[PDB]
């Protein structure tokens, strides 16, 4: 468990806002996308396993990591669609090519599965873990954090996230089996040290989760892309977690139904990269070698 970020930070302005990203190596792209409340930092111990297998790209979502904050910020900002507009523009700017392997977690999986479904001819394979794969009910959601996420999805969410930073301070470490070092935790806290709107992305994201049919637009998006995943012969690598968090139970059964997929299981809850980076990295490398090595 290295504490240092991978690679050098780079920035490009997208719609007048700086977006930060890692871009190392050469060849066909391997694109790692984080979710909430993380950044490219999440992949620092995984990316080294793919050196020499492609061009390794990991972007920080708008409002997250080293990327700029939107202003004026408020409850109408950092929706799925807004996040998608920024990210997909950054990916276009980076000229990723047409043999992309996506490596996806959490909201990074909704964004990446959506991108792949819109660019089917440019995606070579998808590796995913603890991903958003189907509309949910609360029965699918980890029991220990049902009240907290229902809380986020109410007016209580503003104090919880913007004042108390509960996503970063409580949800993130609660969903890692090991204890992070102070140094690692400081990297996850850095984008969100200031109280108030700086923390808005951490609150907007849970409000987009497709749970009991709301928000309908996200439910519809996920139904669309999963309808493709269910039938496509695109190669897939499912990294299961034990105990896991959002892919457990019937959702885990469902993902296992998808075609042209292999899996592994690693120890972890939600932020599996922080419990099992060597096993994850090794599996993705083996996947990519099978797809590419000759």
Active site residues: 106, 130, 270
Minimal distance, residue 217 CB to Cl ion, in Å: 16
Distance CA 293, CA 272 (A): 27
Size of the site for Cl ion (CB under 5 A): 3
When asked if residue 202 is in the footprint of Cl ion (CB under 5 A), the reply is no
Minimal distance, residue 245 CB to Cl ion, in Å: 11
- Select 67 or 204, whichever has its Cβ closest to Cl ion: 204
Q: Which stretch binds Cl ion (CB under 5 A): 29-37, 174-182, 236-244, 273-281?
A: 29-37
- Select 246 or 288, whichever has its Cβ closest to Cl ion: 246
- Select 86 or 205, whichever has its Cβ closest to Cl ion: 205
Residue from 80, 188, 192, 205 that binds Cl ion (CB under 5 A)?
205
- Select 206 or 268, whichever has its Cβ closest to Cl ion: 206
**In the window 135-164, what residues touch Cl ion (CB under 5 A)?**
none
φ and ψ at residue 194, rounded to 5 degrees: -85, 130
When asked if residue 248 is in the footprint of Cl ion (CB under 5 A), the reply is no
Q: Which stretch binds Cl ion (CB under 5 A): 79-87, 187-195, 202-210, 214-222?
A: 202-210
Residue from 206, 235, 244, 268 that binds Cl ion (CB under 5 A)?
206
- Select 23 or 130, whichever has its Cβ closest to Cl ion: 130
* CA separation, residue 224 to residues 73, 120, 170, 240 (Å): 30, 13, 33, 23
φ and ψ at residue 134, rounded to 5 degrees: -165, 150
Q: What is the DSSP string of 173-191?
A: HHT-SSPPPHHHHHHHHGG
Minimal distance, residue 202 CB to Cl ion, in Å: 8
Residues 57 and 34 sit within 8 Å (Cβ to Cβ): no
Q: Which stretch binds Cl ion (CB under 5 A): 38-46, 80-88, 206-214, 237-245?
A: 206-214
Minimal distance, residue 54 CB to Cl ion, in Å: 29
Q: Does the bond joining 215 to the residue before it have cis omega, within 30 degrees of 0?
A: yes
- Select 93 or 144, whichever has its Cβ closest to Cl ion: 144
Minimal distance, residue 120 CB to Cl ion, in Å: 27
Residues 227 and 133 sit within 8 Å (Cβ to Cβ): no
Residue from 31, 32, 34, 36 that binds Cl ion (CB under 5 A)?
36
Residues forming contacts to Cl ion in the complex (CB under 5 A) are 36, 205-206
């Amino acid at each position: 468990f290295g504490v240092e970020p991978y690679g050098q930070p780079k920035y490009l302005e997208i719609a007048g806002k700086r977006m930060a990203y890692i871009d190392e190596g050469k060849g066909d792209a391997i694109v790692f996308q984080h979710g909430n409340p993380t950044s490219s930092y999440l992949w620092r111990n995984i990316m080294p396993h793919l050196e020499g297998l492609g061009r390794l790209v990991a972007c920080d979502l708008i409002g997250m990591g080293a990327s700029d904050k939107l202003s004026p910020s408020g409850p109408d900002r950092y929706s799925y669609g807004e996040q998608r507009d920024f990210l997909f523009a950054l990916w276009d700017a980076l000229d990723l090519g047409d043999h992309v392997v996506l490596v996806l977690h959490d909201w990074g999986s909704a964004l990446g599965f959506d991108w792949a479904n819109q660019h089917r001819d440019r995606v070579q394979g998808i590796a995913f873990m603890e991903a958003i794969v189907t509309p949910m009910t609360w029965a699918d959601w980890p029991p220990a954090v049902r009240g907290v996420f229902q809380g986020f999805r109410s007016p209580q969410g503003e104090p919880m996230a913007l004042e108390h930073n509960i996503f970063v301070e409580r949800v993130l470490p609660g969903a890692i089996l090991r204890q992070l070092s102070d140094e690692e935790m400081n990297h996850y806290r850095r984008p969100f040290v200031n109280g108030g709107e700086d923390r808005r992305p951490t609150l907007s994201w849970p409000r987009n989760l497709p749970i009991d049919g709301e928000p309908a637009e996200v439910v519809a998006l996920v139904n669309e892309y999963r309808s493709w995943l269910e039938e496509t012969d695109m190669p897939k690598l499912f990294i299961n977690a034990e105990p896991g968090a959002i892919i457990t139970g019937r959702i885990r059964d469902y993902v296992r139904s998808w075609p042209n997929q292999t899996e592994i299981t690693v120890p972890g809850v939600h932020f599996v990269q922080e419990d099992s980076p060597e096993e994850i990295g090794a599996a993705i490398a083996q996947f990519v070698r099978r797809l590419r090595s000759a």
